[PDB]
């Protein structure tokens with residue numbers, strides 16, 4: 001907050017000021033500060049360069065780890081907002097969408113509960129925007145819990161390519177960097193050129209008649225502060241240390257230029273030159289982590305599944321195991337072998353009572369349908385019953401106007417389950433939350 | 443629209459909404475004019491009497 | 492007790508942007524109890540058995 | 541019931557509209573929603589080019605969110621579309637209801653808003669309430685911890701020696717209530733159970749009151765809403 | 777199927793609307809009709825009432841009867857309400873038609 005104590009003062013009377021070094025996003029809002037005019041694009045915007053990477057790497061599935069504060073808040077806001085393009089009347093190209101955006105807590109020394117529930121997802125790219133304390137635990141976690149395996153693709157912001165992070169930096173990570181970086185001097189010339197271009201335009205109106213000086217007595221917003229600020233932020237020149245220094249819709253340095261660096265296991269090395277859409281890799285070889293060199297497809301479609309199903313006499317019977325860890329065979333009227341699959345039912349004893357997640361081999365009719373499908377589409381599965389014990393409906397919890405899902409439908413839309421096969425109806429209301437097959441018995 | 447079935451060869455190119463009226467290969471039968479029992483003349487009394 | 496469990500439906504061009512909407516709306520039609528009235532208007536007659 | 545919403549990029553709007561949506565999908569009542577729009581303060585021709593699609597949206601209820609100036613301008617564009625007849629209302633929050641005695645001729649009638657006025661908030665009584673809050677919170681802190689901090693030696697020079705514990709004041713200071721009336725606060729920095737008022741821009745080009753609100757209860761005064769072809773019927 | 781009709785004070789209109797009425801009510805087809813309007817271009821505050829009562833009509837087909845200047849005026853207003861896009865096909869006789 002080293003720039004604040006002056007952003008307020010001349011903010012009173014609304015005297016415009018110019019920002020040089022800091023790059024946090026808080027100072028951008030038009031409601032908390034009427035004073036900043038930013039020469040260095042703040043860390044927020046650098047999200048889009050990743051979206052830009054997506055147009056030449058196609059890893060449409062994607063994981064995000066926003067660290068929870070206003071800093072990361074804006075990062076999530078912006079990245080989420082990027083996807084809203086492609087009205088689709090082109091004609092329906094595959095649109096990259098964010099997967100489970102696992103949020104965070106800044107001051108935390110154990111993240112193990114986050115990575116396995118992350119590693120067991122469907123994607124293979126990691127975009128971590130964070131701070132310097134954060135990369136420490138992030139790396140010291142991922143590099144040891146069997147996370148940095150090959151096929152993993154990483155990205156970070158400008159604040160993770162340095163600090164203690166490098167002193168725990170995993171291989172092949174990728175960073176972002178502006179062409180300038182820090183410069184206590186160069187942008188000064190740029191800014192005074194801005195104010196120059198502003199002055200000789202000020203004569204066009206010059207109805208200000210003063211910016212009120214003196215301490216006491218002149219307690220009135222100078223009636224041309226905002227207008228002169230619009231003027232200043234509307235200053236167009238093209239010759240400083242960077243060309244066409246512009247001011248954004250919110251009034252920030254528009255169209256700066258980046259260049260995608262990279263760590264060579266002990267050495268940062270530039271690869272490309274990022275400029276709006278101008279992002280081209282220079283003379284080098286983009287080496288990817290986990291000991292690999294080909295462009296890795298960020299998707300790994302899984303073959304396992306977890307399927308839940310209900311208890312029902314004509315479709316899915318339930319029988320306890322034997323008395324040693326087995327369960328008993330049986331044949332048909334034609335003596336045909338009927339299948340039986342191991343079933344981890346959490347309901348060894350009835351409701352209104354305890355509940356135990358004992359195995360209890362279960363079979364039926366839809367069981368037969370499932371096994372028929374398995375040999376047809378190269379599957380492998382593990383089955384278990386429903387915790388609650390009813391089809392599943394809508395309701396209102398907290399005895400308030402809330403709305404969610406009970407039963408197996410809820411055990412699925414939780415993200416817990418993965419596929420549902422049982423005698424489940426097909427209504428209208430339950431359609432707007434899920435996709436259904438074709439029908440298989442009227 | 444109109445009376446149109448659903449199979450694979452048609453599910454290849456065009457796409458199909460969820461069907462509304464059921465259908466399928468069925469049978470048609472006809473009733474029978476009465477079935478007077480063969481052992482009628484010993485029916486209307488129990489074994490006791 | 493029928494053989495070829497299929498259903499009449501509606502056919503649209505491949506992967507358009509109306510499959511979803513007509514789907515939701517026709518399931519709505521079932522859920523609100525109207526197709527019974529329609530079948531009563533044309534499909535089934537009076538000669539219930 | 542609610543219909544289309546228009547706003548213009550002002551800081552603190554996505555929160556608003558997302559609150560609307562998240563509370564309109566989380567209701568057991570037969571709600572609905574129409575085409576939400578988006579505006580721009582940059583230039584003028586596109587405004588009338590898009591602010592009219594909402595008009596064809598037969599939405600008797602429109603929510604706006606801006607400041608008084610672009611508010612006046614968009615209202616002028618509305619009168620340029622007309623929109624002063626019976627049926628079209630507006631519900632706009634306090635951030636446009638300025639000093640509650642200025643009446644630009646642009647504002648059509650019926651323009652309701654929520655405000656929070658001193659007209660029962662009595663400055664002396666509120667001083668009393670505040671002294672109550674602070675002193676009783678210090679009391680509750682004493683009940684927690686049998687010691688109490690000291691005034692800082694300087695507003696600026698104490699910084700070289702500002703070496704003390706970490707104050708968990710808000711962890712309790714948010715939660716204090718006495719004098720019968722409960723004043724549990726919020727963590728994120730505002731009140732809980734705020735007392736609000738509702739104004740209506742009467743055709744008298746003024747506004748004082750219609751009804752009062754408190755603790756999630758609508759104490760009204762107009763059991764049927766007025767007008768600016770409407771019949772009344774009775775049964776047994 | 778014919779919907780509302782709008783016009784102004786240009787002479788020779790009563791006979792027009794009387795024709796439309798008499799030939800729409802001596803015909804065994806199920807036509808209809810909606811709010812038949814009348815304007816006053818002679819007032820600038822009428823343009824407000826112009827947009828006002830103009831909004832009150834919703835009609836996939838419209839008839840209008842005036843001369844070229846008033847036509848430009850009314851159409852310039854209507855481009856600001858939305859009577860010109862998809863569907864609202866206008867119909868005018870050959871009086872404008874210079």
Ligand SMILES: *[C@@H]1O[C@H](CO)[C@@H](O[C@H]2O[C@H](CO)[C@@H](O)[C@H](O)[C@H]2NC(C)=O)[C@H](O)[C@H]1NC(C)=O
Nearest residue numbers: 710711712713714715716717718722723724725
């Ligand atoms: C906030 O303060 C309230 C009291 O102001 C706490 O409430 C509980 O303890 C009080 C002690 O006398 C009781 O009077 C209240 O009845 C009791 N609450 C209920 C619902 O019974 C409350 O725990 C405090 N909470 C926090 C988070 O500080």
Ligand SMILES: *[C@@H]1O[C@H](CO)[C@@H](O)[C@H](O)[C@H]1NC(C)=O
Nearest residue numbers: 180182183184185186187241
């Ligand atoms: C800042 O930019 C100027 C302009 O190119 C350059 O000469 C100077 O070396 C830069 N500052 C540093 C510390 O490199």
Ligand SMILES: *[C@@H]1O[C@H](CO)[C@@H](O)[C@H](O)[C@H]1NC(C)=O
Nearest residue numbers: 471472473474475476477478
């Ligand atoms: C069945 O009985 C009806 C009674 O009138 C008679 O008309 C018909 O011919 C009979 N048919 C057969 C197959 O017995």
